[PDB]
Amino acid sequence: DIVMSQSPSSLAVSAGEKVTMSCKSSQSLLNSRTRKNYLAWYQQKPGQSPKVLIYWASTRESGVPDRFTGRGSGTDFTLTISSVQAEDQAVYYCKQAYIPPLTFGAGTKLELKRADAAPTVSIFPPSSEQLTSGGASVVCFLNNFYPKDINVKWKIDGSERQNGVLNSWTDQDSKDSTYSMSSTLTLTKDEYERHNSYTCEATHKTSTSPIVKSFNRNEC
């Protein structure tokens, strides 16, 4: 089979800047008869189906912005994008269709960098209908923080541990290019009311000192 290699496997760039992706085929895709390389690039955003950007290695399909380009012949191709913008947040695939089986590259993930940002955290105690049922989830939100890595832990203070502290992450924001996670602290009620203060600890590039957000066993 024709084996498709893509590089790099991920890339992070800033807005306005030129991004270049490469695709190499294990053998040529030049079609003798046609005079056309049977090479196509697709983009695919979180949640969606893929959509073509380029076909015949260098033909741009109607409605894709001219900032998208490709080139190459044989076995070396590239995809260039002249101004990356948050909307260009996605995975890009090349696909050959020279001789079957049709095969894809394992895809280049394109992510934007931008100016650092502090998260915006927010604590939430559990909630009646839930209390009522037996559990006690507690929840925190670190939405809109730039560098993607981040950690987290739970403390009823001198207590700081976990079990059932499940967190989640989202893909890079299409608007503002940042990142966010939810943190979701499972206990039980009989226990939640037996313990203390209840805090949130938010470690990021943007602070020596953590961001701490702790709550009302005073309103609650």
Partner: protein, 218 residues
């Protein structure tokens, strides 16, 4: 008005067979072939093969030679895909796509998502999340909803029925104890919260659950 419409997400248990459809619209189904492409959670795209729409002949890619068939129904201008005796690893999204002469796919289905698992269908429970007004007041407020203990995949989430869009962050479910957890996040000026009303909408086709939740101040 030019499209492939694909059947809803499937939940199967190991051993079962599944059969997914893809319905053309807005084009002469006969003029082109249909192919198929899947993709496991978090991975890249794998070509499964194609079927000739003007003779029914299905060429399969060696990875899916076996338990996969490709049929048709031209007269309903539909393609289908059958997978025999499921297995875990068949967990994936499957795609339908129209192939053009110029050697690219033009029109993709949305994909039907196959979930291969023994876990039992369950509904969420929803819980609101509100600002307690125990230590701070900011200009802007972060309401949340939280969607707990359910199976299988999907649950949709909306804020004000769709109207609140612009500062949400709904989270990928996170499997655990054969159960999933989501949650959602919203940010409205406070100049609007009290005030305007903010409710979130959750749905779980599998459990036929629809549920609205207003988020009521503290």
């Amino acid at each position: 008005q030019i499209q492939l419409v694909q059947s809803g997400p499937e939940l199967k248990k190991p051993g079962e067979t599944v059969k997914i459809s893809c319905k053309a619209s807005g084009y002469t189904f006969t003029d082109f072939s249909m192919h198929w492409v899947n993709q496991a959670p978090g991975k890249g795209l794998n070509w499964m093969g194609w079927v000739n729409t003007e003779t029914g002949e299905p060429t399969y890619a060696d990875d899916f030679k076996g338990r996969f068939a490709f049929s048709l129904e031209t007269s309903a201008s539909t393609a289908y895909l059958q997978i025999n005796s499921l297995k875990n690893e068949d967990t994936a999204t499957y795609f339908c796509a129209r192939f053009l002469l110029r050697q690219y796919f033009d029109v993709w289905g949305a994909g039907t998502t196959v979930t291969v698992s023994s876990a039992k269908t369950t509904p969420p429970s929803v819980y609101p999340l509100a600002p307690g007004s125990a230590a701070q007041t900011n200009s802007m407020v972060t309401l949340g909803c939280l969607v707990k203990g359910y199976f299988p995949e999907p649950v949709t989430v909306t804020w004000n029925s769709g109207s609140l869009s612009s500062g949400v962050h709904t989270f990928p479910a996170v499997l655990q104890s054969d159960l999933y957890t989501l949650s959602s996040s919203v940010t409205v000026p406070s100049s609007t919260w009290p005030s305007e009303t903010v409710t979130c909408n959750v749905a779980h086709p599998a459990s036929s659950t629809k549920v609205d939740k207003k988020i009521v101040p503290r």
